[PDB]
Amino acid sequence: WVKILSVVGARPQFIKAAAVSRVLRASPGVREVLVHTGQHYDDNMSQVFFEELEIPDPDYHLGIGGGTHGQNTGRMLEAIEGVLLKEKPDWVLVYGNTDSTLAGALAAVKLHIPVAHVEAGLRSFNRRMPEEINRILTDHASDLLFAPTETAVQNLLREGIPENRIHLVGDVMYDAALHYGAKAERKSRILERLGLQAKGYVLATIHRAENTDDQERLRVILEALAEVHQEVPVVFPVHPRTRKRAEAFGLGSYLEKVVALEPVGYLDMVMLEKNARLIVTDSGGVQKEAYFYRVPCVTVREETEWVELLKAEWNYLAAPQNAKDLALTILHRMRTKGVEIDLYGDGRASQKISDFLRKVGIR
Amino acid sequence: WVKILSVVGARPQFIKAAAVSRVLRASPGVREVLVHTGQHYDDNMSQVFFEELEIPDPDYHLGIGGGTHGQNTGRMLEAIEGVLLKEKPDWVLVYGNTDSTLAGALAAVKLHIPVAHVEAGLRSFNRRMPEEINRILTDHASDLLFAPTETAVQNLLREGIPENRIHLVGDVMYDAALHYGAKAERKSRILERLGLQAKGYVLATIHRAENTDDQERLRVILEALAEVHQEVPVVFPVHPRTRKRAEAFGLGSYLEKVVALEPVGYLDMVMLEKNARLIVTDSGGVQKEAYFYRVPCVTVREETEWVELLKAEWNYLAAPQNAKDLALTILHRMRTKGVEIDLYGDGRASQKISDFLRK
Numbered sequence: 199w200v201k202i203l204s205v206v207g208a209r210p211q212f213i214k215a216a217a218v219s220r221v222l223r224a225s226p227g228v229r230e231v232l233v234h235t236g237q238h239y240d241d242n243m244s245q246v247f248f249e250e251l252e253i254p255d256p257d258y259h260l261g262i263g264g265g266t267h268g269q270n271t272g273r274m275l276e277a278i279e280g281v282l283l284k285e286k287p288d289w290v291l292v293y294g295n296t297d298s299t300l301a302g303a304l305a306a307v308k309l310h311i312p313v314a315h316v317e318a319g320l321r322s323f324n325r326r327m328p329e330e331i332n333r334i335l336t337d338h339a340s341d342l343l344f345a346p347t348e349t350a351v352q353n354l355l356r357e358g359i360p361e362n363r364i365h366l367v368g369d370v371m372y373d374a375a376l377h378y379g380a381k382a383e384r385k386s387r388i389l390e391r392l393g394l395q396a397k398g399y400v401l402a403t404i405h406r407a408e409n410t411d412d413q414e415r416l417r418v419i420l421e422a423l424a425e426v427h428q429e430v431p432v433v434f435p436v437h438p439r440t441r442k443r444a445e446a447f448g449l450g451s452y453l454e455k456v457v458a459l460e461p462v463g464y465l466d467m468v469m470l471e472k473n474a475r476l477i478v479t480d481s482g483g484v485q486k487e488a489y490f491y492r493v494p495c496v497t498v499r500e501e502t503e504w505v506e507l508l509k510a511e512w513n514y515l516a517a518p519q520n521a522k523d524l525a526l527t528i529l530h531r532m533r534t535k536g537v538e539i540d541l542y543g544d545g546r547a548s549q550k551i552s553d554f555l556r557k558v559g560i561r
Numbered sequence: 562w563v564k565i566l567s568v569v570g571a572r573p574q575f576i577k578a579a580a581v582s583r584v585l586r587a588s589p590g591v592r593e594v595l596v597h598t599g600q601h602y603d604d605n606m607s608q609v610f611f612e613e614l615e616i617p618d619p620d621y622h623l624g625i626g627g628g629t630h631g632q633n634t635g636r637m638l639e640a641i642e643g644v645l646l647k648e649k650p651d652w653v654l655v656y657g658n659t660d661s662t663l664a665g666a667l668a669a670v671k672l673h674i675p676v677a678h679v680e681a682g683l684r685s686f687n688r689r690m691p692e693e694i695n696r697i698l699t700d701h702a703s704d705l706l707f708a709p710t711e712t713a714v715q716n717l718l719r720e721g722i723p724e725n726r727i728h729l730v731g732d733v734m735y736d737a738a739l740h741y742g743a744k745a746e747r748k749s750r751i752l753e754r755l756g757l758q759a760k761g762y763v764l765a766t767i768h769r770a771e772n773t774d775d776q777e778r779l780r781v782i783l784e785a786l787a788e789v790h791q792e793v794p795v796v797f798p799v800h801p802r803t804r805k806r807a808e809a810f811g812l813g814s815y816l817e818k819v820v821a822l823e824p825v826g827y828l829d830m831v832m833l834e835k836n837a838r839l840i841v842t843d844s845g846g847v848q849k850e851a852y853f854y855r856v857p858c859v860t861v862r863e864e865t866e867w868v869e870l871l872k873a874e875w876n877y878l879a880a881p882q883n884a885k886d887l888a889l890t891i892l893h894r895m896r897t898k899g900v901e902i903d904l905y906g907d908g909r910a911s912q913k914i915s916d917f918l919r920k
């Protein structure tokens with residue numbers, strides 16, 4: 199009856215989409231079309247998520263990826279528009295803040311197709327971040343804004359977005375963690391294969407462009423991880439951009455001084471996060487995931503969007519300026535806990551989102 | 562030296578860049594680089610402005626136009642990104658609110674090149690207009706905002722954009738009218754070849770998507786204008802978009818019933834605006850221009866971005882609901898006038914901008 203077309207491109211977008219897609223598939227008023235831009239294309243970055251989270255094959259795969267901002271965004275814009283003219287959906291759902299997100303929103307909004315932004319209103323206040331551009335422009339292009347936190351609500355209101363278009367629904371990635379938890383615990387044997395026990399390692403992920411594209415920042419990080427490793431084993435699934443940059447900069451050797459893995463699937467990843475002594479990341483989603491599992495976290499950035507984690511003291515910023523301090527901060531915070539607090543809703547964000555889409559009516 | 566790279570695609574943008582470039586051309590410590598996206602390509606929509614306004618040849622011409630929103634915008638984003646990578650400017654300047662404008666900003670922001678928006682903060686609150694989306698996304702992507710009006714300023718502040726990034730400089734298209742008026746006087750002979758008497762006609766332009774793509778709205782307008790023509794001749798430079806939609810909906814006879822022209826150069830157009838009894842338009846520029854020459858204006862839309870013109874009684878909104886209502890509104894308004902008031906500044910917006918960019 200109502201057709202809702204989702205646009206996904208990259209790993210974190212398949213996980214969110216998994217959770218929301220489940221509710222939309224199950225809903226009777228609702229046919230879904232999934233468009234995968236091709237932004238993430240390696241099997242351990244894309245395929246594995248579709249398999250392990252039980253997502254059906256995309257209705258479209260545009261096969262666009264590996265280019266500049268300008269190539270990727272631009273080619274995505276044109277190709278998504280193509281799909282949209284054929285499919286003529288009632289809603290376009292875009293997720294998060296990848297180049298794929300912005301391309302989806304821009305494609306839709308000029309065709310007068312209502313766009314709903316899942317994970318809306320987050321701000322880094324750091325415009326050099328491409329993801330800051332993406333979420334600002336996406337949000338102002340959107341008709342519905344599904345905010346995960348009250349901070350995000352307040353950001354949107356401050357940018358003069360009407361309250362009637364903003365919905366605090368919490369976080370679908372919490373829905374996903376809750377839902378897929380039993381499957382992870384049953385199926386992952388990553389601890390076994392690595393020979394690791396509960397709380398006998400630190401988990402690390404790093405891929406922010408601002409960390410990977412600057413040789414000195416990256417060196418600071420790899421070196422701090424290696425030092426940390428001497429005291430507590432460090433498990434490092436390595437983003438494909440991070441590996442490419444490490445290699446290009448001649449930092450290959452630093453990956454040998456830790457337990458460096460290829461990108462892992464969600465199920466393995468849950469298990470690593472759950473059983474870590476501490477998570478160190480520059481990832482958006484991992485910051486929250488650490489909090490889900492009540493594991494202290496260190497964010498290797500000058501800022502985070504998820505400021506509630508800092509207030510609650512589950513998270514702590516440590517910009518990579520010298521390996522000495524970064525290593526020290528990590529080992530110190532390894533001993534901390536934040537305060538008890540519920541964030542991110544009740545794990546039924548996707549259900550709230552589905553309901554608001556079905557019941558908004560024609561303008 | 563500061564490298565300022567201007568991105569322009571459409572007629573209105575050439576006219577603004579004309580005013581801004583003359584100032585930067587003759588400014589110490591500034592190299593100007595101009596990219597033409599190719600969005601307007603016809604000689605009567607593009608080349609004629611470069612020629613008559615003495616705008617230098619573009620350093621680059623990306624040759625993109627005539628496609629969808631998606632196609633135009635997408636190819637311009639990739640192409641403009643190409644040039645920026647080769648030129649590495651200190652600033653990107655974008656103008657107005659066309660698809661070219663958005664591509665330009667978006668290309669630049671992702672390379673961490675600062676973007677200045679010339680004519681920032683205008684709002685129609687008609688979110689469906691592709692120009693509203695364009696100016697909103699652009700304003701939010703820009704680092705400097707050159708607002709032409711106080712309302713444009715209040716619009717930005719309401720959207721959370723901080724005061725220290727907003728400069729009220731007035732309107733460069735005012736600058737342009739001043740500078741080129743004289744030349745329009747000596748070189749324009751359009752009244753001669755059309756055989757019109759000064760104040761012997763009404764001037765019309767229509768090209769908003771929401772008027773042209775909607776058969777019934779376009780019908781009301783060409784109907785209404787033909788009835789106006791029975792009473793006072795109607796002179797109608799027909800935008801190419803308008804011509805094609807009119808022809809598509811089999812409305813081309815209403816065009817022949819009035820004095821329907823291909824698009825004309827800025828010089829002819831200045832003449833026509835100056836010497837019209839009243840101007841009927843859905844253009845943005847042309848409504849300001851009508852006030853410049855104290856010619857009463859009727860704006861064939863449900864709203865305007867330039868609210869000060871309604872308030873000053875120089876302009877009057879007339880939604881295209883009914884051919885006869887629209888025509889009577891036009892015929893009525895032509896023996897009206899607005900109040901004594903100076904808008905859009907001193908004719909030195911271009912220099913105020915040029916100044917903020919070196920500083």
Ligand SMILES: CC(=O)N[C@H]1[C@@H](OP(=O)(O)OP(=O)(O)OC[C@H]2O[C@@H](n3ccc(=O)[nH]c3=O)[C@H](O)[C@@H]2O)O[C@H](C(=O)O)[C@@H](O)[C@@H]1NC(C)=O
Nearest residue numbers: 210211294295296329435461462463464467481482483503
């Ligand atoms: C900083 C930033 O803007 N980030 C935006 C960004 O996501 P992100 O930074 O989280 O990238 P990412 O960490 O690759 O994926 C995490 C997931 O991978 C899983 N994960 C991670 C590593 C791994 O080896 N295996 C695995 O399953 C983890 O378990 C976890 O579930 O794109 C997102 C999107 O557009 O949807 C936005 O929502 C984000 N915005 C925010 C604000 O968080």
Ligand SMILES: CC(=O)N[C@H]1[C@@H](OP(=O)(O)OP(=O)(O)OC[C@H]2O[C@@H](n3ccc(=O)[nH]c3=O)[C@H](O)[C@@H]2O)O[C@H](C(=O)O)[C@@H](O)[C@@H]1NC(C)=O
Nearest residue numbers: 573574657658659692798824825826827830844845846866
């Ligand atoms: C409504 C809207 O969004 N409009 C935006 C739009 O401009 P616009 O509607 O004025 O298009 P347009 O009317 O073709 O050109 C006018 C010029 O053509 C001259 N003109 C007109 C007809 C003609 O035959 N010959 C000629 O020289 C006239 O002398 C006049 O100088 O794109 C502009 C841009 O991105 O820079 C935005 O600043 C505008 N935003 C605003 C707010 O005005």
Ligand SMILES: CC(=O)N[C@H]1[C@@H](OP(=O)(O)OP(=O)(O)OC[C@H]2O[C@@H](n3ccc(=O)[nH]c3=O)[C@H](O)[C@@H]2O)O[C@H](CO)[C@@H](O)[C@@H]1O
Nearest residue numbers: 208209237238239240243264265296297328329438439442
């Ligand atoms: C601009 C943008 O949208 N950035 C997002 C992108 O980062 P990410 O760094 O993956 O951004 P891109 O999609 O531009 O990929 C960058 C580079 O990674 C390599 N590559 C990428 C994918 C793949 O399957 N194989 C591969 O080798 C290529 O060298 C490619 O050029 O996804 C991340 C999640 O994982 C998000 O946090 C980022 O916000």
Ligand SMILES: CC(=O)N[C@H]1[C@@H](OP(=O)(O)OP(=O)(O)OC[C@H]2O[C@@H](n3ccc(=O)[nH]c3=O)[C@H](O)[C@@H]2O)O[C@H](CO)[C@@H](O)[C@@H]1O
Nearest residue numbers: 571572600601602603606627628658659660691692801802
């Ligand atoms: C979406 C967009 O940016 N719209 C702007 C564009 O409208 P405009 O209507 O020109 O928008 P486009 O640039 O998409 O052109 C639309 C159509 O006009 C025809 N065409 C255009 C140019 C040309 O030289 N020859 C030709 O034939 C083509 O059929 C083209 O597909 O410029 C106007 C100024 O004139 C601005 O008021 C509009 O905001």
Ligand SMILES: [Cl-]
Nearest residue numbers: 403404405437
């Ligand atoms: Cl990662």
Ligand SMILES: [Cl-]
Nearest residue numbers: 766767768800
């Ligand atoms: Cl026109």
Ligand code: NA
Nearest residue numbers: 222223225228
């Ligand atoms: Na369904």
